Design a binder for this molecule. Structure first.
Ligand SMILES: *[C@@H]1O[C@H](CO)[C@@H](O[C@@H]2O[C@H](CO)[C@@H](O[C@@H]3O[C@H](CO[C@H]4O[C@H](CO[C@H]5O[C@H](CO)[C@@H](O)[C@H](O)[C@@H]5O[C@H]5O[C@H](CO)[C@@H](O)[C@H](O)[C@@H]5O)[C@@H](O)[C@H](O[C@H]5O[C@H](CO)[C@@H](O)[C@H](O)[C@@H]5O)[C@@H]4O)[C@@H](O)[C@H](O[C@H]4O[C@H](CO)[C@@H](O)[C@H](O)[C@@H]4O[C@H]4O[C@H](CO)[C@@H](O)[C@H](O)[C@@H]4O[C@H]4O[C@H](CO)[C@@H](O)[C@H](O)[C@@H]4O)[C@@H]3O)[C@H](O)[C@H]2NC(C)=O)[C@H](O)[C@H]1NC(C)=O
Ligand SMILES: *[C@@H]1O[C@H](CO)[C@@H](O[C@@H]2O[C@H](CO)[C@@H](O[C@@H]3O[C@H](CO[C@H]4O[C@H](CO)[C@@H](O)[C@H](O)[C@@H]4O)[C@@H](O)[C@H](O[C@H]4O[C@H](CO)[C@@H](O)[C@H](O)[C@@H]4O)[C@@H]3O)[C@H](O)[C@H]2NC(C)=O)[C@H](O)[C@H]1NC(C)=O
Ligand SMILES: CCCCCCCCCCCCCCCCCC(=O)OC[C@@H](COP(=O)(O)OC[C@@H](N)C(=O)O)OC(=O)CCCCCCCCCCCCCCC
Ligand SMILES: CCCCCCCCCCCCCCCCCC(=O)OC[C@@H](COP(=O)(O)OC[C@@H](N)C(=O)O)OC(=O)CCCCCCCCCCCCCCC
Ligand SMILES: CCCCCCCCCCCCCCCCCCCC(=O)O[C@H](COC(=O)CCCCCCCCCCCCCC)COP(=O)(O)OCCN
Ligand SMILES: CCCCCCCCCCCCCCCCCCCC(=O)O[C@H](COC(=O)CCCCCCCCCCCCCC)COP(=O)(O)OCCN
Ligand SMILES: *[C@@H]1O[C@H](CO)[C@@H](O[C@@H]2O[C@H](CO)[C@@H](O)[C@H](O)[C@H]2NC(C)=O)[C@H](O)[C@H]1NC(C)=O
Ligand SMILES: Cc1ccccc1-n1c(C)nc2ccccc2c1=O
Lengths: 80, 333, 106, 104, 168, 60
């Protein structure tokens, strides 16, 4: 994701405010970062209580795509 | 009123195709230079920019008048109507005068026929930078000028006592370099056209090693110490000392690529890329040492056990020694 | 409005000694500060125009010094015909004057 | 351009010293092997015109390319070979080595 | 006078103008010079979004490694290595945009401190691994101390830096 | 390279995961690189379709 952003920004002017493409890339980066942090949280409680770890994995499987779809719909209805 | 009469009398029956003293003696021209700024010095094109006020003075007995007026102070309007020396800069990739809002030119004619002619110039002057010892490299490269078509028998240039004057040097555009002084020189060069008096001004520039330090040297040594960090990791077949090594190598090669792209494509070895190559050898040595250690784990455990500490001590000492040798050799040169 | 503060309001001094008058500008006024001398029952007379430019006929003992917001008028070998009000005025914007300094003999 | 070969003739003054300064040229990436001076005539639809050709033979210096692009390839190939000295049990290590070498 | 809509600045902001008149001595005589000064103020949003947020995210990612269990050695090694590589790339990129000045800017100091934090996190992990399986209590103690120390120190540094470079 | 991961043993999860992720990253880099040579037209070229199908195969 960082590579995508860096390649994109090398073709625009140095603009202060946030562009819509920047908003989308930031949101996607936040999603990836949240996935990594969710894995770290799982690993923090792996040994002590694997049941809640499995529950968290299932909940993530269910609720990452849903929140991503909601964010996409919000983004594409705000601008278009 | 009567200055118009003087000007009309001066130009009547006057031929600006002929230099003063056409068939008598060479025309002597005294030159002065005021250096406004010395622009960026891009080693990629081996050139530097310079903005100057260029003053030329000579005697023209045809421009001789008698009046209470002692000096005629004129603008560029009359420059094209009298004879002007065809001075050009020999090592200039390109140059241009300034023309806004009017031609930045000045002409003054004195009672006895002395002429002063000044104009503003920006010049991109070529000089070949020998980039050995870069970025600990010092250069003194010239600005040469002469007449194009008049050989020594016809025009002779002469530096005044205070010919070259510099400004403040605080507002100049020298980033990698610092101005440390200058000197002027004269000589005669032989060409297919004839012998020409060539005047030269040498500007002494020393590179300041503050940008390249933080741009290349610190990251490379930091990568080297990161490579060292591997020697303390748990000693096994763990990928923590394999991925670490290979990532160190790829970062090293990327840094080398960027650093070399900093400067022009010269076939010889600079001081910077020797350092990068040595830091590139150190990381490879650490990685191969780990490989051999892991191979010997299966054969001899004590061998690997003592090898880890031996590398842990032999690497930083060798790196410090190389740093000392490198900096001592290059700084005292 | 640019208000100019002049100090001291009044100062009594003896002949032949260096006396300095200070003017302070509320805002930036590059060098468009003038010093005028007004003798009793007389119109003001321009002494210094711009910053540190003696006007014609002004004795060389009147010296002006300036800045972006701090200006001083310096009199050197004072004489007895210098007893007058001294005003500083800016001209960077619509002109404004200070209160003035009443020179005294003592 | 305008004057055909019966109006104008071109020739080198000296025929070998007409061109000077070649040996003093230094190029960062090339070396001037040599140069030739040619006299010929070229035919166009509007007539035949004199022509002079000056040509340089430039050889590229190799050392810069060696340093910048060749060594890294050999070094990455050797680092890929290093995978053979790792035991087959360490799948992650060998696969990381190979993939990283491909990426490099 | 500046036109109301006549602004082609995108990275700066025009605060106002200022004129002056003066004299310059020259070897050819004494000339009048008229001066104008345009007071400009750089906008910070672009540099925030493109350097400061990436560096803060990289530091946070490096500090995440403290919450991984001591058994997942390659995980923490990858965290440290990739964070250091990211910091180096960011330093290069952020230095690209600028003239090659010979001194250090505020951005340079911020990048250097973030680079130091990432390296210190890597060193802490190396020390933990060194003391693992020999003094597990000590390793656990240092890890659980770092988990609070590193974010706290980074926050304190950020607060100090911004307070000193914005209250100005 | 992505399809070579099939022949690995199922008891090596890190290796096949690395294969997949690095192949996807390489595909993304190639897709970013390919367009850089062409003007910014608003439709898909034949090369775009080829890259899309290759990305689909790697993802699958
Ligand atoms: C291949 O083709 C190319 C394209 O055709 C060709 O390039 C052209 O070459 C010619 C010949 O050299 C150039 O014409 C000359 O230009 C000189 C100025 O050069 C600078 O400025 C021009 C633009 O010129 C405008 O601005 C100046 C000053 O601002 C004016 O003086 C000009 O008249 C002209 O003004 C008009 O345009 C302005 C807008 O720009 C208007 O605002 C204005 O109102 C006018 O309408 C630039 O283009 C130049 O840049 C180019 O050249 C430089 C060279 O180094 C390059 O580096 C650069 O990259 C560009 O290539 C440059 O910056 C003129 O000075 C010159 O005219 C004087 O000389 C001739 C001959 O001596 C006189 O006949 C003429 O009358 C002028 O002399 C009078 O004025 C001078 C002023 O100093 C006096 O000293 C002199 O005594 C004399 O005074 C008398 O007349 C006055 C009235 O003129 C009067 O006031 C006096 O009282 C007195 O009576 C000449 O015109 C042309 O610009 C080039 N064009 C381009 C695009 O480059 C190339 O050579 C060809 N190659 C070959 C191999 O053939
Ligand atoms: C870089 O690239 C350029 C362009 O290709 C090369 O230019 C060629 O250079 C060679 C060597 O200088 C030229 O070869 C010469 O051609 C001449 C013309 O020959 C024609 O005309 C004669 C009669 O006028 C006919 O006999 C012949 O059939 C052709 O129709 C020859 O006169 C030259 O000498 C030859 O003849 C004499 C007398 O018989 C012999 O003593 C010689 O040994 C030789 O046989 C010579 O052959 C060639 O013409 C150039 N080509 C072009 C297109 O100009 C450069 O050489 C190349 N390298 C460099 C460093 O620039
Ligand atoms: C994306 C995420 C990226 C790729 C995901 C790979 C996951 C592997 C395949 C799932 C699997 O292993 O099976 C599912 C289920 C049915 O089991 P089955 O009967 O074997 O059917 C499967 C069989 N037909 C076949 O060929 O795969 O097993 C379960 O454990 C059920 C509980 C979770 C189900 C997922 C829904 C939540 C998110 C669903 C996603 C929400 C979609 C909304 C998006 C708009
Ligand atoms: C371009 C320039 C780049 C240059 C890079 C070089 C950077 C140099 C920066 C290098 C410094 C590296 C930072 C820390 C790494 C490991 C420290 C560590 O933990 O090992 C010591 C150990 C010994 O004591 P114990 O085990 O607790 O003993 C138990 C009992 N006997 C008792 O003492 O009570 O534990 C401690 O001391 C814990 C405190 C350190 C960690 C938390 C704060 C540090 C980070 C916070 C501070 C880090 C901020 C970074 C700098 C501002
Ligand atoms: C996980 C959730 C998804 C990630 C969240 C994305 C983070 C966005 C951060 C961007 C910062 C931001 O919003 O800045 C403002 C932009 O306003 C805006 O225009 C942004 C708000 C509205 C944007 C339209 C919809 C965007 C997506 C919304 C979905 C989020 C909920 C799910 C102000 O920027 P500035 O600097 O111009 O301000 C004054 C400049 N002088
Ligand atoms: C994905 C990541 C989620 C974050 C959401 C996106 C944030 C967008 C950034 C906003 C950029 C922006 O336009 O704001 C600047 C504010 O400057 C300022 O004055 C802000 C400067 C503050 C620096 C950033 C503070 C964060 C550091 C906190 C430390 C974290 C420690 C955690 C351990 C612009 O400003 P302008 O010059 O255009 O003026 C005119 C408007 N303001
Ligand atoms: C610039 O050139 C002038 C003329 O050649 C030099 O002037 C001479 O300076 C030396 C001192 O180095 C004196 O001994 C001569 O008497 C001077 N000659 C004249 C004619 O003035 C001057 O030194 C040069 N500037 C340098 C070298 O910096
Ligand atoms: C991904 C992205 C989009 C827009 C602005 C910034 C970033 N962004 C972020 C949010 N985090 C990074 C962390 C490390 C390296 C680069 C980036 C980066 O470019």
């Amino acid at each position: 994701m960082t590579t995508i952003n860096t390649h994109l920004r090398e073709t625009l002017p140095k603009i202060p405010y946030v562009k819509a493409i920047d908003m989308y890339l930031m949101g996607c980066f936040v999603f990836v970062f949240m996935a990594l942090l969710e894995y770290a949280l799982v690993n923090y409680i792996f040994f002590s209580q694997p049941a809640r770890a499995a529950a968290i994995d299932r909940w993530s499987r269910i609720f990452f795509p849903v929140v991503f779809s909601f964010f996409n719909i919000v983004y594409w209805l705000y601008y278009v | 009123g009567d200055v118009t009469v003087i000007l009309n009398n001066l130009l009547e029956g006057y031929d600006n195709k002929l230099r003063p003293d056409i068939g008598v003696k060479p025309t002597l021209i005294h030159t002065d230079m005021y250096v406004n700024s010395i622009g960026p010095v891009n080693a990629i094109n081996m050139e530097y920019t310079i903005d100057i006020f260029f003053a030329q003075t000579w005697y023209d007995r045809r421009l001789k008048f008698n009046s209470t007026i002692k000096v005629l102070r004129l603008n560029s309007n009359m420059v094209g109507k009298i004879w002007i020396p065809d001075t050009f800069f020999r090592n200039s990739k390109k140059a241009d005068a300034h023309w806004i809002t009017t031609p930045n030119r000045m002409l003054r004619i004195w009672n006895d026929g002395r002429v002063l002619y000044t104009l503003r110039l920006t010049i991109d002057a070529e000089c070949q930078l020998q980039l050995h010892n870069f970025p600990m490299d010092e250069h003194s490269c010239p600005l040469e000028f002469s007449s194009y078509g008049y050989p020594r028998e016809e025009i002779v240039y002469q530096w005044k006592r205070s010919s070259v004057e510099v400004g403040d040097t605080r507002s100049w555009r020298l980033y990698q370099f610092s101005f440390v002084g200058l000197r002027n020189t004269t000589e005669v060069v032989k060409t297919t056209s004839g012998d020409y008096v060539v005047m030269s001004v040498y500007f002494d520039l020393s590179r300041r090693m503050g940008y390249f330090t933080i741009q290349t040297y610190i990251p490379c040594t930091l990568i080297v110490v990161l490579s060292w960090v591997s020697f303390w990791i748990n000693k096994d077949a763990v990928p923590a000392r394999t991925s670490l090594g290979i990532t160190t190598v790829l970062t090293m090669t990327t840094l080398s690529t960027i650093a070399r792209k900093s400067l022009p494509k010269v076939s010889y070895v600079t001081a910077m890329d020797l350092f990068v190559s040595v830091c590139f050898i150190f990381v490879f040595s650490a990685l191969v040492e780990y490989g051999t250690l892991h191979y010997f784990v299966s054969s001899q455990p004590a061998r690997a056990a003592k090898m880890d500490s031996y590398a842990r001590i032999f690497f930083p000492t060798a790196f410090c020694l190389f740093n000392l040798v490198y900096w001592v050799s290059y700084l005292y040169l | 409005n640019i208000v100019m503060t002049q100090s001291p309001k009044s100062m009594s001094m003896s002949v032949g000694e260096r006396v300095t008058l200070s003017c302070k500008a509320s805002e930036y006024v590059g060098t468009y500060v003038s010093w005028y001398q007004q003798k009793p029952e007389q119109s003001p007379k321009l002494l210094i125009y711009g910053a540190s430019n003696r006007y014609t006929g002004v004795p060389d003992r009147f010296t002006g010094s300036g800045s972006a917001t701090d200006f001083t008028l310096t009199i050197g070998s004072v004489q007895a015909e210098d007893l007058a009000d001294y005003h500083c005025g800016q001209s960077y914007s619509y002109p404004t004057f200070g209160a003035g300094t009443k020179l005294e003999l003592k | 351009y305008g004057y055909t070969t019966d109006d104008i003739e071109f020739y080198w003054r000296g025929d070998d010293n007409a061109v000077t300064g070649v040996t003093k040229i230094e190029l960062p990436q090339f070396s001037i092997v040599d140069y030739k001076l040619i006299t010929k005539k070229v035919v166009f639809s509007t007539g035949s015109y004199p022509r002079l050709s000056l040509s340089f033979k430039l050889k590229r210096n190799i050392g810069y390319f060696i340093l910048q692009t060749y060594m890294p390839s050999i070094l990455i190939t050797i680092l890929s070979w290093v995978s053979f000295w790792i035991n087959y049990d360490a799948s992650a290590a060998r696969v990381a080595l190979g993939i990283t070498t491909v990426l490099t | 006078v500046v036109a109301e809509d006549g602004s082609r600045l995108n990275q700066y902001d025009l605060l106002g103008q200022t004129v002056d008149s003066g004299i310059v001595q020259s070897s050819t005589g004494e000339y009048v010079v008229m001066t104008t000064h345009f007071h400009l103020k750089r906008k910070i949003g672009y540099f925030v979004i493109q350097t400061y947020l990436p560096c803060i995210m990289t530091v946070i990612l490096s500090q995440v490694s403290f919450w991984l269990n001591r058994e997942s050695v390659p995980a923490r090694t990858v965290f440290g290595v990739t964070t250091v590589l990211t910091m180096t790339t960011l330093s290069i990129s952020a230095r690209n945009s600028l003239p090659k000045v010979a001194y250090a800017t505020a951005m340079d100091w911020f990048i250097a401190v973030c680079y130091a934090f990432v390296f210190s996190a890597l060193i802490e992990f190396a020390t933990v691994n060194y003391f693992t399986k020999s003094q597990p209590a000590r390793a656990a103690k240092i890890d659980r101390l770092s988990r609070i120390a590193f974010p706290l120190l980074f926050g304190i540094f950020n607060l100090v830096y911004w307070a000193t470079y914005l209250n100005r």
